[model samples]
Target: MEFTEFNLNELIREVYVLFEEKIRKMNIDFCFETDNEDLRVEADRTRIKQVLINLVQNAIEATGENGKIKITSEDMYTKVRVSVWNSGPPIPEELKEKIFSPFFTTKGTGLGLSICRKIIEDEHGGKIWTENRENGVVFIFEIPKTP
Candidate 1:
């Protein structure tokens, strides 16, 4: 993988740019927030962007019209933590684990998220998972600054 150092916030902003029109049309309140705009990571930028786009796409699907979706990133010392949250329905506790498994999905071909797991865990040496928030769900992933 062509790992290079890049700004995490900028990468996420690009994803927001790609979805801005669609999100606006759907009336979804979408935004990306970061505690540190200069947070940098040595990673395969393309792969990370793919993962971010995948998570945002799923978030958009789960949220309804006028719903809210947010992307937040924090600068953890060893690894940068990023999360995509949506004000949509929550996933059942039982299915949370399966969503990352190959060919397991609530809709369509289940390959997207499974591949996401491979990209973050296998290629980038990171971790990815989902959480059930009070009113929504959040997908979080962490990639090391150096590994």
Candidate 2:
């Protein structure tokens, strides 16, 4: 996986910065938060960045204009979990599981989430899934503190 040690929070901040311009252009309220500043992990940096970009891009697309999007992370001793949330309608129950399947998209190419699954689960030995909120959907991925 070309693993390396790096700060997770910093990477997330970079992603927020990278997308801030487009987010503002879309009139979306974007935010990010971390439980602490030193959440470190060993993994493929560029691959993780791609996952973040894909997730954030999806969040922005799913949310309505002027809607809200948030990226949050928590340090769990053995692992860390990151969440990308969009203030869009919740996904249907049936499709929640199927959304990660390859070639299962309603829009463009259906490989984004599928690649995310592979990066998180197959590559990093972590888990990635979506959760239904009262008003939105959140995509959460977890990886061990060390690979």
Q: After superposition, how far is residue 96 of candidate 2 from its true place, in Å?
A: 1.0
Cα TM-score per model: 0.95, 0.95
Alpha carbon deviation, residue 5, candidate 1 (Å)? 0.5
Clashing pairs in 2: none
CA RMSD (A), model 1:
1.1
When summed lDDT is taken over every stretch of 10 residues in candidate 2, the lowest stretch is 102-111
Can you tell me which runs of candidate 1 are displaced by over 4 Å? none
lDDT of 2 by residue, 18-133 (tens): 98888999899888889978988988999999999999988988896898998899999999999999999888899988889896967467739999999999999999999988
lDDT of 1 by residue, 1-147 (tens): 798999989999889999998899999988778899898999999999999989988888889789899889999999999999999888788888888888695547873789999999999999999998869999999999987
